[PDB]
Design a protein around this ligand. Structure first.
Ligand SMILES: Cc1cc([C@H](NC(=O)c2cnccc2-c2ccc(C(F)(F)F)cc2)C(=O)N(C)C)cc(C(F)(F)F)c1
Lengths: 123, 120
């Protein structure tokens, strides 16, 4: 119940535990979605902590996140996917993944248009 | 970039308002009491611009709008015009929020999920 601040974030972004999130409903393929986040000084959603990002339990439908398959799964920044964070489930043949609740990743062709989530970290 | 809040750690912050969703279904009175136990109130809608995140809310949830006059919030203030479209769903004196900027008239005794809000 103790009060603190959250951010810094741009005003039009949701802030939660010092990460900034923005939802985009205009459907784009994975690459176009990544480019859109980058144009906003951001990246596609990166899942690094179930506790610090527990708001993702409330995220419904299916959205691009920054997770890609190198033919291991890894993020845009080049870091690998930590274990016990996401359950990765096959769906459509492809090398990208859609976030869905709760902490699931559905494999999807990178060229399929989807909604997407951008995230900015503050540290 | 700026800071948002203040808010408690487990709440979403948007434009200096704090929001928390509660999945346990409760009637309007129990929901109000739950928010009060967290130094908060049920959702109050005052601005489509400051609260445009409410366009993204899925399903329907108790907010702090009641019929005693007009519809009014817990804090005694009146519902501002041109904020919510009010729709009759159940015989009731309470209202659920639904996107986008709708209020469903609902029996206060019906269990529903709810949204608490804190400001400053
Ligand atoms: C993380 C986030 C997810 C959603 C939106 N899900 C929902 O609304 C949702 C779905 N099932 C249950 C509850 C909720 C919910 C209820 C109240 C709020 C609150 F914020 F009022 F507390 C937030 C979520 C979703 O999944 N999409 C946007 C794709 C919306 C928001 C927010 F409204 F904040 F922007 C945040």
């Amino acid at each position: 119940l103790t009060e603190s601040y959250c951010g810094p974030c741009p005003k039009n972004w949701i802030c939660y535990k010092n990460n900034c999130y923005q939802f985009f409903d205009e459907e784009k393929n994975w690459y176009e979605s990544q480019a859109s986040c980058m144009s906003q000084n951001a990246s596609l959603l990166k899942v690094y902590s179930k506790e610090d990002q527990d708001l993702l339990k409330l995220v419904k439908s299916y959205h691009w996140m920054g997770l890609v398959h190198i033919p291991s799964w890894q993020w845009e920044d080049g870091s690998s996917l930590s274990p016990n964070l996401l359950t990765i489930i096959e769906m459509q043949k492809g090398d990208c993944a859609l976030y869905a609740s709760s902490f699931k990743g559905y494999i999807e062709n990178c060229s399929t248009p989807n909604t997407y989530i951008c995230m900015q970290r503050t540290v």
